[PDB]
A paper describes a structure:
AGT normally localises in the peroxisomes and failure of its detoxification role leads to increased levels of oxalate, coming from oxidation of glyoxylate, causing calcium oxalate precipitation in the kidney and urinary tract.
Automated crystallization trials of AGT-Ma usually result in diamond shaped tetragonal crystals.
Residue numbers in the entry:
A (entry chain A), B (entry chain A): 4 to 390
The structure:
Amino acid sequence: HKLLVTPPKALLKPLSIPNQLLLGPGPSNLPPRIMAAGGLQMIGSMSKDMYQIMDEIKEGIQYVFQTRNPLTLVISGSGHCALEAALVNVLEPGDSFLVGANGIWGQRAVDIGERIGARVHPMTKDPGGHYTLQEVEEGLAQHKPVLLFLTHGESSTGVLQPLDGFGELCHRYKCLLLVDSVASLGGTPLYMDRQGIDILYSGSQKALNAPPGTSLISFSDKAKKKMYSRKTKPFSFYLDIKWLANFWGCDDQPRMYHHTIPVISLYSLRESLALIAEQGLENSWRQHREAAAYLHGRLQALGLQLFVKDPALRLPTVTTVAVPAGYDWRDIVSYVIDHFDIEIMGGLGPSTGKVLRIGLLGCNATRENVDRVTEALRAALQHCPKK
Amino acid sequence: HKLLVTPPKALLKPLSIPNQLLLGPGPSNLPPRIMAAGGLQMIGSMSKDMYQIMDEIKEGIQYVFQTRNPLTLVISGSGHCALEAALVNVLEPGDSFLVGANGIWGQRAVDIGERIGARVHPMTKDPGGHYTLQEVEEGLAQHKPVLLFLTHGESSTGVLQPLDGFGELCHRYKCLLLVDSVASLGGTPLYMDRQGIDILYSGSQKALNAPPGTSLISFSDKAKKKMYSRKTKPFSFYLDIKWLANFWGCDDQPRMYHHTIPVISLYSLRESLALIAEQGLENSWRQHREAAAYLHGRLQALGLQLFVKDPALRLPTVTTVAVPAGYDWRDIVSYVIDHFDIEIMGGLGPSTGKVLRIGLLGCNATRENVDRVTEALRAALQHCPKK
Ligand SMILES: *Cc1c(COP(=O)(O)O)cnc(C)c1O
Ligand SMILES: *Cc1c(COP(=O)(O)O)cnc(C)c1O
């Protein structure tokens, strides 16, 4: 007895949130349908009905990845968590692991790869750079790796990465391909099977406009063959693919309790996958391409220059803009949220302080929101200090 | 081009869920306020306003743990994820790790401990058993471990575990104490600092009645000293306490992007911590003790016998009931959900097939719901096959 801690006074106020228009690299704003799914009641986490939803979510990930892999499921964690789940289950220690260290996502693949004791060979490249099929055949040949990691949408630098044939290249060296489509999914063409991709993951909170906290993953039979014949148990129980696979109905064995899935986020995820199914993929890529074009046009009208020179290399979901001469970037960003209720972002990792990041994602990739962010940025340029 | 996968027809139907009354070991039903928090709009995952919520959540975990540890935060994952985060950050490989293998939660602590390459010494005990301060001083002495794991609320067997002095015992052998309060928090007395606990974690989805997918953790300065002087980097980047700690404002350094936290679940978690703050802890323990008493009474009226003989050892949030002679347990459980819209559960792991599990958690631990489950179970006993 004798209770030390008293009820925090801050908790006895009611919860209240500002209305913000989020137009950075993520998370993005939720449409009404995702919100309505968020406010539903709980069902049992192993109920027949829960399985039925999970199966729909599967079919959903199969559509947006354009894959038919049986080993396709949701990771109960953020984008980082899917990446880690991928790496920890594919890589035994000491294995050869090649990584396109293009921006932060490469760096994290490194960090994680290091952490789980693999021999990681970093093809590091300056921010704004991208990798040709040569640079990767070169790396493939001289390091002879079991797995390559590539960022599709590089949201720290705004670089779209070409993907055609790279999957074939990697098979040619008996290697596995791992693609990060967290920023790219729903916004720019992507076909898992036809591009021969072995591990694809994405996030809930970008173009799909679901709340952050889940992530999507799918494994080819090749990578699936490895995982089921690795001789050591992976370092995570939480992310263990065999346990995971069984629970999501990707096995021959009935579903056995592994962990409690985030039921409510799954309602929302389902709905987000439904919305893009109804619209259809090619229309979503079309929407994002036309919006990003519109935006690009407007920023250059303001005398800003787009960080990535080549337009065919610019990521449509996340645009990098160079920090104009004589401006503190923090001043501009502050001004935008302070005076317009709009969130945009600066750089991240190697792109830090050099760029501004403006995202168009899903239901937010509209000409209306491009207008709103452009005016905000006009105002800042004319009202922020200049040296 | 040439798109292989077509929009799943199942996704083009609208989402719909059955109303169920969940009265197993978790998840539990959400009150209206948690639901309303679920349906809110997104704010930026690194906004000043998001930090402010996270700080309230901190103060919230400090209250329900009754701790003042600065190293207190949320894990973006399920109950299992907190456990793993605890173990992966405390234990370097080869370390001596003692675990009360009382039910499944011990077994998982084993599995995980094994996975991260520690020398795990399992004090295995038959289901329904609990550990005295002797059995643990014995184990402490002969294995000399750096960390002990104990389940407080053992939801697979319904055993409440005594905790007073065990923290002192462990310090006496220079050891660290790890407690699982996932099932027990909010339902039965628990004081982190006064019981000298070094690592406490719980779940969102039990007595707190938030949606599943986040979990609560707190570290004493002792365990915190270890983690900051371990010589090897842990096997997970996702759960790395230094990265985590920094982002949740538990550092001297400004918050640096680690991963995107589940913003919406955090709204809900906050509200759940507010609701128990307003009610007050001791009233919640009182509610749960009086409900579990009521329930116990009613089941014995039906001629069922409570799995745990000693009442002072029965977990109030999760009651184990022996499977009556001549009944298929699956028949009963089915009958309950089929005819009453009520979920109860069977055993789990070592308790499988031997028991029925009935949970009372938070806003659901009411005399009203005890009535409803008792009648359901009357009906099943009189309407299910008997050998
Ligand atoms: C935002 C982002 C991530 C990280 O996802 P989290 O949900 O923060 O874990 C990973 N990859 C890319 C390309 C991203 O844009
Ligand atoms: C339900 C439960 C867990 C597991 O939590 P998840 O949220 O399924 O990861 C762990 N410990 C106890 C005591 C539980 O009751």
